[PDB]
Amino acid sequence: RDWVVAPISVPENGKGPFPQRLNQLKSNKDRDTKIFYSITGPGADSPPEGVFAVEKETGWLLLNKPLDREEIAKYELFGHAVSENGASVEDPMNISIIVTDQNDHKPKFTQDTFRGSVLEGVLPGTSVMQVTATDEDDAIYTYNGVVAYSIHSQEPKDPHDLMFTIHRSTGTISVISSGLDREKVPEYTLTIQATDMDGDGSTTTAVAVVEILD
Which residues make up the interface to Ca ion (CB under 5 A)?
68, 70, 101, 103-105, 135, 137, 144, 196
In whole angstroms, the minimum distance from the beta carbon of 10 to Ca ion comes to 12
Question: Rounded to an integer, what distance in angstroms lies between the CA atom of residue 112 and that of residue 133?
Answer: 10
Cα within 13 Å of Cα(159), Cβ side: 9
Please report, as a single letter, which amino acid is at residue 190.
L
* Residue number, 103 or 193, with CB nearest to Ca ion: 103
Question: Rounded to an integer, what distance in angstroms lies between the CA atom of residue 108 and that of residue 204?
Answer: 7
In whole angstroms, the minimum distance from the beta carbon of 196 to Ca ion comes to 4
* Residue number, 90 or 196, with CB nearest to Ca ion: 196
In whole angstroms, the minimum distance from the beta carbon of 200 to Ca ion comes to 5
* Residue number, 90 or 135, with CB nearest to Ca ion: 135
What is the chain's percent helix, strand, coil content, to nearest 5? 5, 45, 55
CA angle 77, 83, 89 (to 5 degrees): 60
In whole angstroms, the minimum distance from the beta carbon of 102 to Ca ion comes to 5
* Residue number, 38 or 144, with CB nearest to Ca ion: 144
